[PDB]
RNA sequence: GAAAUUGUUGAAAGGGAAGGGCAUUUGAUCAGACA
RNA sequence: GGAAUACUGCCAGCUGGGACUGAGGACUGCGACGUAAGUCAAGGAUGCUGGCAUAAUGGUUAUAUGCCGCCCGUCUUGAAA
RNA sequence: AAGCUCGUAUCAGUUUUAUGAGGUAAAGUUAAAUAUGUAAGAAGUCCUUGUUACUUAAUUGAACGUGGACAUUUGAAUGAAGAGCUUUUAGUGGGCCAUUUUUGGUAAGC
RNA sequence: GCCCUGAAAAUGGAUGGCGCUCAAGCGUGUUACCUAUACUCUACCGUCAGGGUUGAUAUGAUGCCCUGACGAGUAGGCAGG
C-alpha cells in the first residue's frame, strides 16, 4: 500500500554531505540567536533530537522563542487557500541566519551615513537602487583594432 | 462634448500648443541642414568595400 | 463501476479566486509558547515599570 | 473583450440611505445630506452614515457611558452626540450636567438628564447650534456584547460558546468537552 | 458687482501668461530635440572622418502593443500585461526600459509587438488617442487646465510638456505615463503585413521587438 | 524571405577590466532589414566565439551597395544547407546583374529544387568570377557564347479581356 | 357558446415536407399628418 | 572631379473626389483674427431650393427571391440522435 | 446576498537586486533550465537613562520601556475599479479534452 | 527533391463539388484585395462608480442633472416589475 510517514521519502534529503560527515564543527553552537532574527533552516542528518519535518527544508522564518538547546521559528505555510502560522522546536544545529539581514543592515547604515554626510552637501541624495540601465553612448576606436571578416564555415564529418 | 483632433482642425491645434503658430510661418518642418566637408577615413571605406 | 479517484487540476485555480491571503500579521504578537521563565519575569518588568512612573506621575 | 483584474458592476456595500420607512427619520437624512455636501466640515459626514445604521449595529449608550467621556479630560464642556438611543443607568449615583443630543432617549434618561441642570436635545437642535460640529463628541455604544456575537466563529478549540436551547448538566458536556470521556475539544 | 467685468481682465491676463510660459517653454524643446539629432548625425560622421566607429546610445523608451487575444494566455503572461495596462488587443502604453521592466517584455513577447518610437509618433498619439486618468473617470485632454490640474504639481503644464516627459523618459515618467490612460488603437490602416501575425517579427510575423519599425505600425493604428 | 539587402555588422563583447577592447568581428549579412540583418547576425557568431546578444555588442550596420549595379556579372556561391536527411555543401553559380540580386535567386533554386527554407540555408560565399572559362558550371557557359540570339519560344499571349473576335497567333 | 376539428365562399401558394430569422420588391391594408 | 535620381524618414506642407453621423438646445470656457468695433471652421448643423400632401414615405400581413435556419423537454463528459 | 470599520493604502498567479534550499536532464563525485523560501525599513535606525522576582562573577545581558534625533529617492521596477472585516446560505461533490511530461498495457476514441 | 512501384475489400462516390497540366498541383518571394458579434469613432438602452443641485412664487428628492467605465453565461443566488 501507499505510505506517509513523517520522514518518508527523505532518502537524498538528510544524507550528510559527502566528506563532510562526522561531527558538527563548534562554531555552530557559538552562534547566538536572538528574538526578532531570521534564519533559515537546513536540517543536519546526523542530530535526531529537534529536528524539523522535511516540509521546512530551506524555508525561513522569525525567532518568537530562545530555549535550552532550541529556538523558536514562526513559518508561513501554505494550505488549502490560504496562509498559517507555523511554530517550529527546533535546536540550533539544524539553523544558522541568512545573511539577507546582515547585508540589509549593511545598506541601512551607509543610507544613514550618506544622507546626514549630504546635509551639510545640499541633497540630492539618490538614495535609491535602479536597476541596470541601457548603456551611453561611446566612441570605438578602431585604432590598433581591424575589424576580422568571419564567414559561416563548410560541413565536415570529422568522424 | 465633441472631440475636436489637432493634426486636422487648425483652430483646436492652436489652443494646444501657441508654439503650433510660429512653428509654420518660420517653417522648422523643411528648415535647411548646415553643409559639411568630412569624408570617410581610408580604414572605414577600406572596411565596407572589403571581402 | 470504478470512479476517477484522485485530481489537483482547478484547485491552484480555485485558490487564487480570493488568492492566498496573507498572515494579518499585528504588533506585539501572541506569547503562546514563549519560555515560561522569561515570560513571568516579564510579567513583574511590565509590573514594575508600569508602576515605575505611578511614583513619576502623579 | 476586456480583461478584468477585478469583478464588475460590483457594488459598495454599504448603506446610501436607511432601509426604514420612518418619515421623521428621512427628514434628519434630507437635513444632513444637505450638511454633509456644503459645509465642509467632516462632523456632518459622519453623522450622515450613522443615521443609515440597521438596529444591531446601533447599540444604546448608557447614561453612564456619557459621564466618562465628560470625565475624558478637557471634555467637561462638550456636547456628546449619541446616533442611537440613550439609556438609563442608575448604578451611578452622581452625573454631571452637560448637555446630550440623540435620537431616541428612554424616560429614565430623560429623567436624570434633566435632574441635574443638563439638557436633552435632538439632532436637528444641534445641526442648528453646531452645524460644523463643534465642540461635540460623537459616542458609540458596544457592538460585540451582543448575545449572538457570542456564538460567532464556533469551532474547535476557539472558545465561542455552541448555540443551544437548555443550559445545564447533561446538554452537551460530556464527550469531547472533558478529557475523561473521550477527548476534550 | 465687480464680479464679472472686474474679475474677467484679471483673469484673463493669467491667461495670458500661462500661454505665454508655454509660448518659450516649447520653443526651447524645439531646439533641444533638434541640436540632439543633428549631434547624433555629426557624431557619426566625425567619427567616420577618424576611422572609427560610433555605437549609439541604447533606446531608453519602447511603446508595447498587444497583438493577442483576450483568451487562451498562460498565467504568467497574463499577469504581466495586466501591469503593464495592456488589457484589450491594440492597446499599449510607453515603456520605460530598464533591467527591470526588460526581463518582463521577454515573457510577453508571443503576445506583443514593441519597438521604438520617434518624436513623431510620440507627438500623434497624444494629441490624436492621448486621454488623461483623473479620479480614473478617462479623460479627453484638449485643454492645459486637464494636464495643470494634475501634474502641475510636477511642472509638466501643458501638453507639449508631457510629449517631453516621455520622449525624454525624465524622472517623472512614472507619474506622466500613469496619467496617459492606455492608448487604445485601431487597427492598422495598410494591414498589417504578412499573411500570419504570431511569427515572430524575424520570422515574417508581427510580433517581437521590430525596433524603429513600430513608427510606421502605429501610424497605420492611429 | 524578402527582396533583400546586403549588410555589414560589427560588434565587440562588452568591455571588461580582464580583457578590454575586444575584437570588433564584421560580417556580410543577406537580410531584408536591420533588425533582421542583426538578428542573424549574432546567429553567426554563436558558431564562432564566446558571444551572444546580452554578452555582446552591434558597433556598426551599413548597408552595402553594388558598386556596379548595371554591368551583369558571373557569381558562384557556396551554401550549406540542412537538408530532412541531413546537412550538404553545394557550389551554384548565379549569372545576374549584382551580388544580392543573385542571392534572391538563389533562395529561390534553393527552394524549388531542394524544398530548402531560409531557415536551412546557410551561404558560405559569394564571389564574382573575374575570367570566364573559370565558369564550371554548363548552364552558365551557356550564355557566353559569343554573339548569341535566340527567339522568345511559344509567344505567350496575357489575355487582358473576356471575348476577342480575331483567335490569336503566336507569331513573333 | 372558446379551442381542437369540419363544410362553403373568397384570396394567395405549390419540382421529394412544412414552418423560422435578416433584407427588400410586388400585391392588400393602416393611421398619423399635414394643411 | 562633380551631380541627379532611388530608397528611408520627417513638415504645427498644399489641394481634389467619395461614404457615414448631425448627439445636445439661453448665455458661461479656452482660443483664433482684428488699432478698433467686431467677426470666426473656437465646449456637437446650418442656410437655400424644390416636389408630393400623396398611401409618396412609413407601418402591418400574404407571397416571391438571396443567404442562413436539424426537435422540443430530460438525464448525460457528450443528443439532431 | 447582507453589510461593517475605514480610505492613502497595504497588497500582487509579475520582474529585478540580495540571499538559502534541491539532486531530475545532461556530465561521468559534479550539476542545470523552468518552478521554490526570505529581505528590500517608521512594527525603522542611531544614540541617552529606566524596570524585573529571569540571566550574570558583575550595573553585566535579555525583553519592554522614558528622553532626544533622522520624514517622502522613506530606501528597487511595474501595477492596484481601494484596503480590510464579519455574518449568513444556494448549488456541486459522475467530469471530459488538448498541450508538455509519464506509469501500467501489445496497442487503443483504453 | 518531385513522380512511379511497393499499394488488395466488399451499395455508387467524393482535395467539399465542378473541374485544373508554362495549373486552379508542389517549394519559395513581393504585393493588391475579400470579411467576425474582436479593434477604433458615434448615437441609444441598461448596470456600476464619482461628483452637482432643497430658496420661494408648481406639478416628482424612490427626483432632476454631470462624468466615466462596463455588458457572454448552465446549476445557483439576488433586485425590479
Redesign the pocket.
Known sequence: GKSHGYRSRTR??FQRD?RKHGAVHLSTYLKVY???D?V?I?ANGSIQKGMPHKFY????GVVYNVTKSSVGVII?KMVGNRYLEKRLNLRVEHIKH????Q??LE???A??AK??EAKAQGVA????????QPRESRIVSTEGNVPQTLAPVPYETFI | ????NP?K?K?????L?????V??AE?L??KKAEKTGTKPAAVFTETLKHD | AK??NHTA?NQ??KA?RN????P????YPSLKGVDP??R???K??????AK?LAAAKK | ??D???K????????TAP?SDNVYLKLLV?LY??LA??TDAPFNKVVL??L???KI?RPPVSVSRIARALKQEGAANKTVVVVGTVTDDARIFEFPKTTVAALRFTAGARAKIVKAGGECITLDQLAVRAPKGQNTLILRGPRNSREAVR???MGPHKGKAPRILSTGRKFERARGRRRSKGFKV | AEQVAAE?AA??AA??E??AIILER?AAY?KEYETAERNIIQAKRDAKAAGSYYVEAQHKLVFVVRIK?INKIP??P???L????LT????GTFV?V????L??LK?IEPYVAYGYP?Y?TI?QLVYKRGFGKI?????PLS??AIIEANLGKYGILSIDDLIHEIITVG?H??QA??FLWPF????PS??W?VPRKFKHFIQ?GSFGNREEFI??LV?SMN | ???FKEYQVIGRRLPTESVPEPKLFRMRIFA?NEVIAKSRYWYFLQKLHKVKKASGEIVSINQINEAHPTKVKNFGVWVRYD???GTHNMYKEIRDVSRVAAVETL??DM?????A??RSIHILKVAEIEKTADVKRQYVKQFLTKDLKFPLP?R?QKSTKTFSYKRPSTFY
Open positions: 537524498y534529503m559527502f536572538k528574538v526578532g531570521i533559515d537546513k527544508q530551506g524555508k525561513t508561513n541568512s545573511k539577507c539581514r547585508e540589509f545598506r541601512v547604515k543610507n544613514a544622507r546626514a541624495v539618490q538614495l535609491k537602487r535602479q536597476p541596470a | 462634448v465633441l472631440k475636436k493634426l482642425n483652430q483646436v491645434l492652436l489652443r500648443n501657441p508654439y503650433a503658430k512653428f509654420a517653417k518642418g523643411s | 470512479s476517477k487540476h491552484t485555480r487564487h488568492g492566498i491571503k496573507k494579518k500579521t499585528y504588533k521563565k522569561f513571568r519575569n516579564h513583574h518588568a511590565l509590573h514594575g515599570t515605575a | 473583450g476586456i478584468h483584474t477585478s464588475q458592476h460590483k457594488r459598495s456595500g454599504h448603506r432601509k434630507k445630506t444637505f455636501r456644503r452614515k450613522a443609515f445604521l440597521s449595529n456564538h460567532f466563529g | 474677467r483673469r484673463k491667461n495670458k500661462k500661454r516649447n524645439q487575444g498565467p504568467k497574463r499577469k504581466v495586466q501591469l503593464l495596462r484589450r488587443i491594440n492597446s520605460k530598464t533591467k527591470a521592466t526581463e518582463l515573457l520617434s513623431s507627438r479620479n480614473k473617470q478617462r479623460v485643454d492645459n524622472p515618467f512614472k505615463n500613469n487604445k488603437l485601431s487597427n495598410g494591414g503585413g515574417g513608427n510606421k501610424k | 524571405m524578402a527582396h531584408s537538408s530532412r536527411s533562395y529561390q527552394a524549388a529544387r531542394h524544398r527554407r531560409f511559344h505567350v
